[PDB]
Structures are given as C-alpha cells and as structure tokens.
C-alpha cells in the first residue's frame, strides 16, 4: 500500500528530474557574456525623513509616486509627502505590535496588521476631517505577515499558520483559502494582471497559485534555509528570491528551472529584501551588514553599494515612474536615494 | 516664492510634530517584562497573586509601573517572533522542579534561550515552583534521583539534609549552564518560591534595580 505509493512518487520525481535535465540546453552566463557591461554606478542621498521614535517594519509607495506610508512600533502610522517633506496624517493604533502596512491603488483606504491577529482597514476620505476605522477582519489562528490589495473590495492575507486567505471587505468572510505549506510563510508577491500570485515559506520552497481556481500550479525548491523576501519580474516570467544562506536566486516559470545564482565569498549575513527597476538591468538587495548592494541582472557582477545606516535594513521600494528609490532601517530614519 | 497654501501646510505640519514629542514622555516611563515557560507550571497562579491573542498585565509597586507580556502558540517554534522583543528589561522564566522526568526538557529550553543570537543583552530571572511538593515527594522515599542523574549519588554537599542537598543540586545544575560563556554581558538570578508566596514583587523590584544599576555604571565607564 504505502510502499507502492512511495515507489510511484519516486518514479514521478525521477521522471520530472530527467525531463528537467533533458530540457537544459546551455548556461545563461555564456549567452549573456556578449552584452557590454553597464559599468560603475554611483548614487547619492537627496532627502532624509525623520520623526519616528522606534524601529520601522514596513513601507509602501503611492501610485502617483509622491506619497507614502510608514509604520513603526511606537503605535503610530504616518502618511508622508515626498517633495515638500510635510506630514498629512498621523494615526494612533490599538495594538503596539505591527509588522506590515498596505496602500490602496485608488487612494482611499489603508491596511494594517500584526501580532493581534486582526487586519484593520482605515478610511481617509471622510467628512469632519478625521480618520476612522472602517473595518476589522478576524479569523486567523496565527499572526499576520503580509497583505496586498486586489481592488477596492478585495484583499489577500498571509499568516504564520501555513495558510493564506482571500477576503471580501463587504461580506467579511474568507471566500477562498489556500493550503499546502509545511512551514510558516513569510512573503507574498502579486502579478501585474492580478491573475496569479506567488508565495514563499520557511521550508525553502516557493509556490504558484491561481486566484480563480485556488490550486497550486507549480512548486519550486532549491534553497537550504528560510526565504525572507520575494520579487517579481516586470515581464511576468521570472522570480528573484533571497534567503538566510546569503545567496540570491533567479527562477523561471515556463522552463520550470533555475537560471542564475547571485553570491560572493566575502559576505555571510542574511538577506532581508529585494527589488528590481523599470528596465530590468538592476537588482537591489539589502543585507544585515549595515548596507545595500546592486547587482547586474545578466552578467552577475557587483556594481555599486549604498551605505549610511547604523542598523540593519528592513524594507525598500522603487516607484512606478522609476525616478527614485527609498530605504528604511532600525535607525528611525527614512532615506530617499536618486 | 511660496504661496499661502504652503504656509498653511507647514503650520499644520508643525502642529502635528508637537504632539508626538509631547506624547512620547508619557510612554517612556513604565517598565516592561516578558514571561516565558512551559505548561504544567503556575504562570496563571503567580499572575493572579501579583495582580491581587496576546495577553498583557499591568501593576503598580512603590509608584513604579510594570507591564508583563506573554505569547502562547506556535508549537514551541518561536524563532521568528522573538526578534520583536529586543528591548525588554528582563525575561521571567519559570519551571517546576517537582517532576523528575521532564527536567531535561527544561535544561534544553534554557540552553536554547540563553544562546540566542538576538538575545545577547537581555537578562533572565529564574523561578522554581512547587517546593513543598518536592519536599513531600522526597520524604515519601519511593522517588529516586540517582536513576535519572547518576552523578547525584557521588555529589558532596558544600529540616532534612536530603531536601536541602537536592535543592542545591538542582540550583547548581541550572546555574552551571549560564556561566559557561556568559562573557560578563548578562547574568542570572536563582530563586526558590512556593505556591502561597506573597513577596515576589520585592524580588522583582530589587533585581530590576540591580540590572539598571549595572547597565548605567557600564555606560558611564567606571570599570
């Protein structure tokens, strides 16, 4: 009984491995060795935003690339303007433990959550010039890690109990639930057309999911430790992942195979966040060594380093227009780089 | 150069800036503590005695305000959410010495916590419960110690000699882990308590005073 099923699973795994080996033609580095290098890139700080009294755990850019939000552990949520560096809104919180924040694409609601196991949705466009709690969503056994918006009336939530959920604000009940993870999940990434989304967990695996059907199309596994951040290619055909083993990896969908590793023998600390740029030549990644690095997306060579913080970096972001990037750390300061 | 609209915006920004600075002082006063331990231990009993989803408790001693936090869940896989508690003054670790079969798990847990990478500055207060039950079980005579720990028979002692010898054996067993690689950055406090004690708050107060004194004296560089 069980032995026959195990033998069938082993045969399926061997067939998949043989197909993957057969599909491999040539290395990517040899193909891309013809392209000329971009060369040395240097950037300098333009503005520093201040006004927090604790560490920072989240950040998200606006759609117009002029406004942003920030969340901290002092119990405050702050809305900031970029050019003039003025403050628009400050919101107190019921719970003092917060790990993520989310900004809407329309520009009318914000989302927060953390160790309290409830995701809170706030409405900004009201009368009497006040911000009130619009809704509270409960029904998760563990803490929350990430959450994004699909539209004005949908939300996707990821928690620490090896599950994910899809919520509708008006109804208030989980219309769909995604399960199949052995270990707690950390990050979550969403496709440009909002038809598919990808997630990663602590079991050194990544899984692809379809919103309409709610079934796991594909699974990937090539790491050795926890996965801390995930990004998505501009085209919609690749992933870049960062883990606790100090190595970054690039994965592909159609070929179902890894392409390249990003590593160096002189760095040992873990990776905390990754991102791309508009064209796709650059890969930005922050580390625990008090600084951030930029890598070539094709030649896999070190290009530039960014320094200026006194603690580890926690989040970073790039605008839609691609004019500038933003970074934050445990120094209670935010820095805008051009 | 700048219109009236920008002037009004800047004025609003300044009035927003004032309140955060004013409010920070009210929160910067109280003290914070974490509570950790296993099941079958008197966390709720001691919490109720001191007083008279995350759960929190607040109390007042000598015009000094204490908050106590504890988290329950994750099936003893806490490697992720411990990183949040990187600024608390102290962690209170409580264990039962009555049961002789589960002590190895207690030693393993203490060794795991003491050697964490992020928790290289936080100090721990060690509480041992069920002293009277231990004394009764010793006086019964049907419970043996040399079976679980062979060294206990060869140990030499530095109401009954047996109970005191067992107590000091347990205390040495727990303390000896901490002093291996302490490096002088953080220390341990061993205490003995029962289920009907009432003077725990004074011990907590004195230990917090000592911790703050050591930190401050290290800051001013008098050593």
């Amino acid at each position, epitope marked *: 009984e069980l032995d026959q099923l195990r033998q069938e699973a082993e045969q399926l795994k061997n067939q998949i491995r043989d197909a993957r080996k057969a599909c491999a033609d040539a290395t990517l580095s040899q193909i891309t060795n013809n392209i000329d290098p971009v060369g040395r890139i240097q950037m300098r700080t333009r503005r520093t935003l201040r006004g927090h009294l604790a560490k920072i755990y989240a950040m998200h850019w606006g759609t117009d690339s002029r406004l942003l939000v920030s969340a901290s552990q002092d119990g405050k949520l702050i809305i900031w303007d970029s050019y003039t560096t003025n403050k*628009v809104h400050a919101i107190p919180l019921r719970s003092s433990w917060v790990m993520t924040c989310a900004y809407a694409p329309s520009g009318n609601y914000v989302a927060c959550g953390g160790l309290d196991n409830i995701c809170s949705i706030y409405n900004l466009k009201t009368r*009497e*010039g*006040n911000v009130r709690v619009s809704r509270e969503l409960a029904g998760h056994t563990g803490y929350l890690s990430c959450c994004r918006f699909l539209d004005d009336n949908q939300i996707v939530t990821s928690s620490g109990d090896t599950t994910c959920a899809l919520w509708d604000i008006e109804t208030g009940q989980q219309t769909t639930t995604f399960t199949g993870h052995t270990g707690d999940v950390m990050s979550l990434s969403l496709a440009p057309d909002t038809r598919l989304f990808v997630s990663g967990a602590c079991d050194a695996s990544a899984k692809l999911w379809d919103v309409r059907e709610g079934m796991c199309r594909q699974t990937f596994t090539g790491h050795e430790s926890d996965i801390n951040a995930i990004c998505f290619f501009p085209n919609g055909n690749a992933f870049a992942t960062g883990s606790d083993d100090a190595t970054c990896r690039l994965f592909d969908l159609r070929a179902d195979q890894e392409l390249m590793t990003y590593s160096h023998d002189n760095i040992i600390c873990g990776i905390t966040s990754v991102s791309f740029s508009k064209s796709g030549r650059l890969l930005l990644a922050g580390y625990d060594d008090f600084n951030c690095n930029v890598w070539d997306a094709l030649k896999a060579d070190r290009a530039g380093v960014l320094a200026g913080h006194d603690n580890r970096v926690s989040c970073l972001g790039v605008t839609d227009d691609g004019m500038a990037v933003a970074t934050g750390s445990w120094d209670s300061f935010l820095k805008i780089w051009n | 150069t700048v*219109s*009236a*609209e920008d002037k009004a*915006a800047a*004025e*609003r920004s300044k009035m927003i800036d004032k309140n955060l600075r004013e409010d920070g002082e009210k929160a910067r006063r109280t003290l914070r503590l974490l509570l950790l331990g296993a099941d079958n231990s008197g966390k709720s009993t001691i919490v109720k005695q001191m007083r008279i989803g995350i759960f929190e408790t607040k109390f007042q001693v000598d015009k000094v305000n204490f908050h106590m936090f504890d988290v329950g869940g994750q099936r003893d896989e806490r490697r992720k959410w411990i990183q949040c508690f990187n600024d608390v003054t102290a962690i209170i670790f409580v264990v039962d010495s009555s049961d002789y079969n589960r002590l190895q798990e207690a030693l393993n847990d203490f060794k795991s916590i003491w050697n964490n990478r992020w928790l290289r500055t936080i100090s721990v207060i060690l509480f041992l419960n069920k002293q009277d039950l231990l004394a009764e079980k010793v006086l019964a005579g049907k419970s043996k110690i040399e079976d679980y720990f062979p060294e206990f028979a060869r140990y030499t002692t530095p109401e009954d000699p047996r109970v005191t010898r067992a107590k000091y054996f347990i205390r040495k067993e727990f303390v000896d882990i901490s002093t291996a690689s302490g490096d002088g950055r953080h220390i341990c406090y061993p205490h003995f308590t029962c289920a009907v004690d009432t003077e725990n708050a004074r011990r907590i107060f004195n230990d917090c005073k000592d911790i703050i004194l050591q930190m401050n004296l290290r800051e001013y560089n008098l050593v």
Partner: single-chain antibody
Amino acid sequence: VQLVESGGGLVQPGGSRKLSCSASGFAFSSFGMHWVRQAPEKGLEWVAYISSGSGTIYYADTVKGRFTISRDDPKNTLFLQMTSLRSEDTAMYYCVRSIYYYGSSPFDFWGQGTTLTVSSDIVMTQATSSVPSVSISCRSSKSLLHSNGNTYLYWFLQRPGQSPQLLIYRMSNLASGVPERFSGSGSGTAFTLTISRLDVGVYYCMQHLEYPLTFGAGTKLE
C-alpha cells in the same frame, strides 16, 4: 454639520455690537474660519480670517483697527467685536470653514447669515453684467499661475434664497455632489466656465493667490 449664527442688532452710529456663531457635528480645532460680508445692493467682500490654533490673524485693509475676532474651542464658538459703528457698515455676515493640505478642498461649507441695519491688489473682470450650451468668461489683471504648477481660481454659485456653494476649484476638479455637466478651463489671464445640457443664478470669480481676497463682479443667468 451645522453652523448657526444668532446675534447682533440695530444700534445707533458710534455704538458697538457683538456677533457670535456656534458649530456642531465636526471637529473645530482642525479647520480655519473666515468672516465675509455682503452689502444689500452690492457683491461679496472678504472681512477677516483666523487660522487653526489662533496662530495667525488677518484683517481687511479698509476696516483694520475697528474690529476684533476670536474663538473658544472648548465651547466651540466663534465671535467678533465691532467698534465705531457707521452708516456704511450695514451688511449681511457669513462665516465659512476651510482646511489646507495636499489635495484639500477649502471653502467647503457656508452658514446662514444675520442681517444688520445701521441707523496694489488684483482686480477681476467679468464678461458682462448679465447674460440670459453656455460659456462664461473671466479675466484678471495678472496671471494666476505659480512655478509649483498650481493655478488658483474658484467658481461660486449663488441661488435665490439659499447660501452660496462651491462648484470648481483649480478649474479642473469637481466638488462633491456636482453633476458632470459642469466644466472649466483656461490659461494665463483667461478663464472659462462651460455648462451643457441645461440652475440659474449668479456666478462669481475668486482670487486666492494673495492675502487680500477679491470677489467677482457678478454675472447672472436668466
């Protein structure tokens, strides 16, 4: 949201009187307040302005040194004291509220008025005294455009027997509750309001670039 004003009375010239107003249904410390008066047989003219937190006070040039404005936040009241009453100081009085930040819509609400009987700057230009798809033109002595990319002009509608409202700010943004038929356009020293699928009243041009605020002459659709 209620702004109720009830005070004052007819007194002899050389006397004094006090005006008061109360607000209910919204936060009071957040906004800034304006006092504006209208003569029985003339247009609108700005009188005084007070900011949030009483940081700044602004008085009109022609009535400086004879009026005083203040407010009490716990009591949610806004009052003024009048001195050296004259014959020409007979006009109805209105109070309005505003809020200033990125993307705000000031001059949102207008309250009811009380009738009082007594016993250089930019000059606007209207198309005509009255005009029975409708387009209305407006002109200014100086271009109302700044380097930061914003241009300042508001369109006010007055209805017979009702308080004025707000329609268009920055000639590209529709106020809440405004049907989509209204529209506005223009450039340096040339402003245009367009309405299709015809609502009659008087429409006012307003300038907010500099502190002394000047209203429009007044054009009526019949």
